[PDB]
Design an enzyme around this catalytic site. Structure first.
Site, PDB file in Angstrom:
ATOM      1  N   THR C 124       0.783  -1.239   0.000  1.00  0.00           N
ATOM      2  CA  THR C 124       0.000   0.000   0.000  1.00  0.00           C
ATOM      3  C   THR C 124       0.821   1.298   0.000  1.00  0.00           C
ATOM      4  O   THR C 124       1.990   1.344   0.393  1.00  0.00           O
ATOM      5  CB  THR C 124      -0.788  -0.034   1.345  1.00  0.00           C
ATOM      6  N   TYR C 164      -2.192  -0.344  10.095  1.00  0.00           N
ATOM      7  CA  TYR C 164      -2.328  -0.928   8.768  1.00  0.00           C
ATOM      8  C   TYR C 164      -1.032  -0.671   7.982  1.00  0.00           C
ATOM      9  O   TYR C 164      -0.454  -1.549   7.315  1.00  0.00           O
ATOM     10  CB  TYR C 164      -3.586  -0.331   8.073  1.00  0.00           C
TER      11      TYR C 164
HETATM   12  N1  LIG Z   1      -8.537  -2.281  -3.053  1.00  0.00           N
HETATM   13  C1  LIG Z   1      -7.643  -1.313  -2.859  1.00  0.00           C
HETATM   14  O1  LIG Z   1      -7.857  -0.138  -3.162  1.00  0.00           O
HETATM   15  C2  LIG Z   1      -6.354  -1.558  -2.272  1.00  0.00           C
HETATM   16  C3  LIG Z   1      -5.372  -0.477  -2.038  1.00  0.00           C
HETATM   17  C4  LIG Z   1      -4.061  -1.003  -1.543  1.00  0.00           C
HETATM   18  C5  LIG Z   1      -3.802  -2.277  -1.291  1.00  0.00           C
HETATM   19  N2  LIG Z   1      -4.784  -3.282  -1.394  1.00  0.00           N
HETATM   20  C6  LIG Z   1      -4.495  -4.636  -0.964  1.00  0.00           C
HETATM   21  O2  LIG Z   1      -4.899  -5.535  -1.951  1.00  0.00           O
HETATM   22  C7  LIG Z   1      -5.414  -6.742  -1.302  1.00  0.00           C
HETATM   23  C8  LIG Z   1      -6.807  -7.005  -1.812  1.00  0.00           C
HETATM   24  O3  LIG Z   1      -7.622  -5.975  -1.325  1.00  0.00           O
HETATM   25  P1  LIG Z   1      -9.130  -5.993  -1.813  1.00  0.00           P
HETATM   26  O4  LIG Z   1      -9.551  -4.605  -2.111  1.00  0.00           O
HETATM   27  O5  LIG Z   1      -9.417  -7.009  -2.848  1.00  0.00           O
HETATM   28  O6  LIG Z   1      -9.857  -6.402  -0.435  1.00  0.00           O
HETATM   29  P2  LIG Z   1     -10.843  -7.530  -0.083  1.00  0.00           P
HETATM   30  O7  LIG Z   1     -11.226  -7.421   1.342  1.00  0.00           O
HETATM   31  O8  LIG Z   1     -12.022  -7.457  -0.990  1.00  0.00           O
HETATM   32  O9  LIG Z   1     -10.079  -8.912  -0.391  1.00  0.00           O
HETATM   33  C9  LIG Z   1      -9.273  -9.542   0.597  1.00  0.00           C
HETATM   34  C10 LIG Z   1      -9.825 -10.925   0.735  1.00  0.00           C
HETATM   35  O10 LIG Z   1      -9.039 -11.581   1.767  1.00  0.00           O
HETATM   36  C11 LIG Z   1      -9.872 -12.369   2.542  1.00  0.00           C
HETATM   37  N3  LIG Z   1      -9.263 -12.470   3.850  1.00  0.00           N
HETATM   38  C12 LIG Z   1      -9.226 -11.490   4.798  1.00  0.00           C
HETATM   39  N4  LIG Z   1      -8.741 -11.945   5.981  1.00  0.00           N
HETATM   40  C13 LIG Z   1      -8.366 -13.271   5.727  1.00  0.00           C
HETATM   41  C14 LIG Z   1      -7.784 -14.284   6.575  1.00  0.00           C
HETATM   42  N5  LIG Z   1      -7.471 -14.128   7.871  1.00  0.00           N
HETATM   43  N6  LIG Z   1      -7.555 -15.497   5.979  1.00  0.00           N
HETATM   44  C15 LIG Z   1      -7.906 -15.678   4.667  1.00  0.00           C
HETATM   45  N7  LIG Z   1      -8.463 -14.827   3.834  1.00  0.00           N
HETATM   46  C16 LIG Z   1      -8.659 -13.609   4.408  1.00  0.00           C
HETATM   47  C17 LIG Z   1     -11.202 -11.611   2.586  1.00  0.00           C
HETATM   48  O11 LIG Z   1     -12.303 -12.546   2.836  1.00  0.00           O
HETATM   49  C18 LIG Z   1     -11.283 -11.012   1.158  1.00  0.00           C
HETATM   50  O12 LIG Z   1     -11.990 -11.882   0.267  1.00  0.00           O
HETATM   51  C19 LIG Z   1      -5.284  -6.549   0.202  1.00  0.00           C
HETATM   52  O13 LIG Z   1      -4.031  -7.037   0.695  1.00  0.00           O
HETATM   53  C20 LIG Z   1      -5.346  -5.008   0.240  1.00  0.00           C
HETATM   54  O14 LIG Z   1      -4.818  -4.465   1.477  1.00  0.00           O
HETATM   55  C21 LIG Z   1      -6.012  -2.929  -1.895  1.00  0.00           C
END
Ligand SMILES: NC(=O)c1ccc[n+]([C@@H]2O[C@H](COP(=O)([O-])OP(=O)(O)OC[C@H]3O[C@@H](n4cnc5c(N)ncnc54)[C@H](O)[C@@H]3O)[C@@H](O)[C@H]2O)c1
Ligand SMILES: NC(=O)c1ccc[n+]([C@@H]2O[C@H](COP(=O)([O-])OP(=O)(O)OC[C@H]3O[C@@H](n4cnc5c(N)ncnc54)[C@H](O)[C@@H]3O)[C@@H](O)[C@H]2O)c1
Ligand SMILES: NC(=O)c1ccc[n+]([C@@H]2O[C@H](COP(=O)([O-])OP(=O)(O)OC[C@H]3O[C@@H](n4cnc5c(N)ncnc54)[C@H](O)[C@@H]3O)[C@@H](O)[C@H]2O)c1
Ligand SMILES: NC(=O)c1ccc[n+]([C@@H]2O[C@H](COP(=O)([O-])OP(=O)(O)OC[C@H]3O[C@@H](n4cnc5c(N)ncnc54)[C@H](O)[C@@H]3O)[C@@H](O)[C@H]2O)c1
Ligand SMILES: Nc1ccn([C@@H]2O[C@H](COP(=O)(O)OP(=O)(O)O)[C@@H](O)[C@H]2O)c(=O)n1
Ligand SMILES: Nc1ccn([C@@H]2O[C@H](COP(=O)(O)OP(=O)(O)O)[C@@H](O)[C@H]2O)c(=O)n1
Ligand SMILES: Nc1ccn([C@@H]2O[C@H](COP(=O)(O)OP(=O)(O)O)[C@@H](O)[C@H]2O)c(=O)n1
Ligand SMILES: Nc1ccn([C@@H]2O[C@H](COP(=O)(O)OP(=O)(O)O)[C@@H](O)[C@H]2O)c(=O)n1
Lengths: 335, 338, 338, 336
Positions: C124, C164
């Site tokens: 991030t 975070y």
């Molecule tokens: N979407 C964004 O804008 C954004 C920005 C920066 C970084 N990210 C990173 O990208 C990744 C995906 O984010 P996203 O937007 O798809 O979020 P999201 O919450 O939709 O997807 C993450 C998935 O991980 C699963 N998960 C969470 N905790 C878990 C655990 N303990 N064990 C197993 N599975 C688990 C959740 O059920 C979810 O389906 C994350 O690491 C997020 O921090 C996303």
């Protein structure tokens, strides 16, 4: 053959390690040095021979797994444990992590990376509960189980009491089950009281040594307490008898694997607290005076019926209570 | 009152949760949605009423602790668990973490932060081992225990067999000891086979339900030929979900009198069935033939397990009302509805 | 080749998974179904093809190790994480366990049992802190970083702010260190805001989607008045899911050349939007008035975050193709469709 | 006031603990006795005053939480750690659990149950990476950082190299963030080499001490190795200056809370291994003979701390010269 002793700097452990060292067995000791006296014990062992000392925490899966994989012992005495009932009541979490968690960390490592390892586990008579399903009689110096004149055997109902009883009991059953399901070479000893040199008794653990310390201070001018009336009975087993049992059983592992055995000094070596005091008074020409606490969270009587183990390997205690007690006194004084 | 149901989206859990919803009891459900069908049950409960759903892993101390301090439930049915013996053999670490670790996480949280919470724990008949110390007879369709014709009571020797037996057994003893030592209000039920709606059975969990699914398949001309482990003469008393609901709630209502005790729970000798007998019931009800192939008997198994429920009936005067025949018919209907 | 996607049922993961399915890449999805919408995404994926779904907790070392040993994937997109900054502040422990512990669980499993596995980690922009060391100006609709007209590159000083930021930054560093020390084939993407279909936004995560949801409601005559934290002039470049799919797969195809590096990823300056600007786009597209109330600015925040993507473009030649206006309209449509 | 020292039986810990005992401060020492010499240090401290010794594992959340709730210290020196880079490569799991897990265990306990507790964390110069972004110069005896003649300050880019660098770095960032987010009174010291009495150096950690040892071993008649060419440099800080730094910083916590400071002997106290060897050879009238190994992983050619930030904040400055401290270290080592 490589022998690993977890909790190897403790009372039981250090005594066993010394025999291993005298027999030329390659020895690995694993301990966190948490018990007061463990460091002394380690120093003493080092004066007896060379071995591998590995500091580690049984609760830590990584520490345990690396220990097994790195040393691949042929046999193991799993003695690292949380030993006091009192502390288990004040810190059940730690008690669970050490006794249950530590044992499972060892069992899993063995199962996955070194399945032929022979393991002897030191369990406790506390897996049997309060034993109030039987009848007792009270004499002047002790209680007596009318139903079980010669002690309790392995057919006694399991009923884990106190967190210590539950954590040791869980570990006990897992040890036995890993032998059945996974073919591990495990042996479980449900131990009654033990005492001897290298034991650094405390108020919470090592009743016989504790009262010896009591009799020792008294001797150099230093009332104490007793939980209940002092008539509760325990068979007492001297360290010398424990060493022979461990090594003999280890040598007969093929015949006894997958079983639990009740271990103790037996009826003839049974003593009540009151009776223990007499003995000490009579040896040191003293008077042991004390106050009373309520009965602990406690078996009125615990005497092991050792037919099972005797039949299996022909082991029997050779050290009498009187004898062992004077020797324990001598050793305590020595500190 | 607030009731917390861990493993609330599972078979027993969702049934109990539905009752709570219908009776206006405030509910909290904690589950990780790992059991296939859990999501379906969650959806199903959501349509029944409002409640607090908390996704979480019972193995995680922080998740459990926060759950208790945040909601401070008055009662709790602790059903989250690793329920397959098979899985326990293939993954003993997971079984231990969920069943023992998870139970201790809850016990510790209640002890430290919400000590008056009543807790009912779902234990198992597997804490009694193989029961080979008893005497058996083999009849045409089943094995009978000669000296325990009415089942086994709580005085049977504990002997945890299989990692599943060991994990549930350790949790079972800890629940009883926490009542003794720390004064918690716990109750333990050593359960024999349960079946009913909301149960999404699998090969290795939910034998009645699985065999009902085998029947539905055959009825529809689905070729997915099955097996049985052993000769099929092994027996279990079966308990319908309706009876399980009345037991939990009745027990809860009398917790003050039963706290600190374990009770063997089952449909009793009158509702016992061997697999061969179950098959007949299905063949009759469905007009089919249940063909199968025999596999070697299971590693760890009990030839017979029937609960002698004198203890629980004497304490709360609860008894099973749904017959094996009636329940199995209902179960087939439900299975066919999916 | 087998591709493992942890967090496979989430927003990014489901988008990536769907592409693997369509290209016929063997897929393993690992998820605990904790994010609302994860079950829907799972069902959705199920309708596009077949794959191995493994329910599991990334925090659990045993679940993770078994997953790797059992499936031995050739590549992995490690997306399972604790995504909310607010949640990270209310529950730092969980945030740490998921983001740092889970990533380490994976790294160690790969290092010991499947060292060839290629891994892409979603980090991030929060690893760069508040960015207050630069100079900014304020206009009627947004803030602007006067000394970083093309956004921030990988040369920006690391300074983890928020739990975070700290958990993601620690994982990020470990990912890069494992390539150096242990020779693993890791790639880290420091991502700025992402949005698109399959994203089920909440108040706490997916700001773009969240506000689109707000527009739909208003549109639909619905009233759930909302707020914004601060004045709405804070800016983020926004990247649409379509661009993100190409990035991951193109990157994977070039792993040998990019292993051991971190890259700032975002929609770039041309796709930079402030909240106020976003509102304006929505009001226009929908013909509504987006009313709101302002709350204190979020404690931990960047007034501007725009990725300067020169490093990644130079390495793999990927560049975003979906404009902010076009992506937002699409997002609105996705949102309305739900 | 109550002072808790985790890793209290180690080199820094025992030194700090002795001072505390000397000032009549209520002390709590927490350690697992894992380091060789820890038991010796515990025995040494025992005769200096009364204190509470708590054996425990920093990795264990239950041990750490109970420690905090039971003793409720007003201040804490968090020194319990996995100190060796080498070992971190061989057991990254353990390094992570001790340095990151242990520090978060402590931070969570303090945050939740004793939030005013002052905490000083001993971080490392390794959070700065290999420092290859700078230009160096080789001389007959050492490397020189052309761009940073006075050493490196806090404005150097963070880039954690090695598992030890990653674990210490993550803990370092968490210490700083808990201050900002949760209002905790934390201070981070990014420490360069320290040495002095009570240090039981090993091949893996305690370079000045290790080589002193090397020195002792020979003189006593009876080969050793060095990683790289020996021209790499470190400023060296004696135990005496470390003690003053800790106590002074602690006393001034209200003004430096939430900050990180690079701590070291400063340039005037910088030494290369080759230069250290002369030192001993002269001081010892001997010849130090060794074999070379490859350079350690991500090993910095130069690490000298630019202490302006800390001196400006509390006016602390090292007073013990390398020549002087090294000779005394030598003397102390020979005495064991
Ligand atoms: N979407 C964004 O804008 C954004 C920005 C920066 C970084 N990210 C990173 O990208 C990744 C995906 O984010 P996203 O937007 O798809 O979020 P999201 O919450 O939709 O997807 C993450 C998935 O991980 C699963 N998960 C969470 N905790 C878990 C655990 N303990 N064990 C197993 N599975 C688990 C959740 O059920 C979810 O389906 C994350 O690491 C997020 O921090 C996303
Ligand atoms: N001595 C008896 O009378 C008696 C009665 C029944 C059972 N036992 C069992 O025998 C075993 C040994 O008993 P003992 O009397 O020698 O006790 P002990 O305390 O002297 O020895 C146990 C040793 O284990 C070490 N240890 C404790 N926690 C550890 C941890 N987390 N990691 C690593 N090492 C750790 C201690 O430092 C100690 O040296 C224990 O399991 C005890 O429960 C003993
Ligand atoms: N149904 C029976 O015949 C029977 C027999 C005896 C014992 N039991 C016990 O009763 C309880 C419920 O059994 P069931 O048939 O309803 O099983 P089930 O699998 O349907 O219910 C268990 C529920 O717990 C959840 N769960 C599993 N692991 C979890 C974890 N780590 N964290 C959180 N939630 C988790 C699952 O997703 C599921 O919803 C279990 O403890 C089981 O051992 C059942
Ligand atoms: N000495 C230096 O030159 C130097 C340089 C930079 C940073 N540091 C840091 O300063 C701190 C102390 O360094 P030191 O030289 O005094 O080291 P040391 O090894 O002498 O002291 C660390 C102490 O912590 C104890 N310990 C280790 N693991 C533990 C665990 N799991 N639980 C409890 N106690 C544990 C050890 O037994 C030891 O007594 C460490 O964080 C170290 O990384 C030291
Ligand atoms: N300081 C002490 C220690 C033990 N005891 C009692 O000593 C008896 C034997 O100790 P124990 O039951 O823990 O010993 P074991 O049976 O495990 O060998 C118990 O009744 C303890 O309560 C006591 O009264 N005072
Ligand atoms: N697919 C299956 C499932 C169960 N069974 C058997 O059905 C019997 C009852 O199953 P079980 O022991 O797991 O049931 P419970 O006592 O836990 O209710 C056992 O002997 C199982 O081995 C079988 O043969 N085939
Ligand atoms: N309901 C919401 C969500 C986000 N926001 C703000 O939207 C901006 C972008 O959210 P963010 O920083 O969490 O997004 P990322 O840069 O991680 O994509 C921040 O300033 C949030 O405080 C808001 O004001 N209200
Ligand atoms: N046995 C040893 C120990 C250290 N060294 C070198 O000594 C230098 C200083 O070690 P270091 O940076 O890890 O510092 P300390 O933590 O030991 O005080 C590094 O370049 C090491 O590689 C060596 O060459 N041989």
């Amino acid at each position: 053959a490589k022998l690993l002793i977890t909790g190897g700097c403790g009372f039981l452990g250090s005594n066993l390690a010394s025999f291993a060292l005298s027999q030329g067995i390659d020895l690995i000791v694993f301990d966190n040095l948490s018990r007061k006296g463990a460091t002394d014990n380690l120093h003493w062992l080092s004066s007896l021979g060379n071995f591998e000392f590995v500091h580690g925490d049984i609760r830590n899966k990584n520490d345990v797994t690396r220990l097994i994989t790195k040393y691949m012992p042929d046999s193991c005495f799993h003695l690292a444990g949380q030993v006091a009932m009192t502390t288990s009541i004040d810190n059940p979490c730690m008690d669970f992590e050490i006794n249950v968690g530590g044992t499972l960390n060892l069992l899993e490592a063995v199962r996955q990376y070194n399945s032929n390892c022979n393991i002897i586990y030191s369990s406790t008579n506390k897996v049997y509960g309060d034993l109030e399903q039987y009848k007792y009689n009270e004499t002047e110096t002790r209680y007596t189980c009318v139903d079980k004149p010669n002690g309790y055997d392995e057919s006694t109902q399991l009923d884990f009491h106190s967190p210590y009883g539950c954590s040791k009991g869980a570990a006990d059953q897992y040890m036995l089950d890993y032998a059945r399901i996974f073919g591990l070479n495990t042996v479980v000893f449900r131990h009654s009281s033990m005492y001897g040199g290298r034991q650094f008794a405390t108020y919470d653990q090592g009743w016989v040594g504790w009262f010896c310390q009591k009799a020792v201070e008294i001797k150099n001018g230093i009332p104490f307490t007793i939980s209940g009336n002092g008539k509760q009975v325990r068979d007492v087993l001297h360290a010398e008898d424990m060493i022979s049992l461990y090594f003999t059983a280890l040598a007969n592992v093929s015949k006894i694997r997958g079983n639990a055995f009740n271990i103790g000094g037996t009826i003839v070596n049974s003593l009540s607290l009151l009776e223990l005091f007499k003995l000490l008074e009579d040896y040191c020409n003293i008077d042991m005076r004390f106050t009373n606490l309520p009965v602990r969270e406690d078996q009125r009587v615990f005497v092991a019926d050792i037919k099972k183990i005797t039949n299996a390997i022909d082991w029997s205690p050779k050290v009498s209570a009187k004898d062992g007690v004077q020797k324990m006194y001598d050793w305590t004084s020595s500190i």
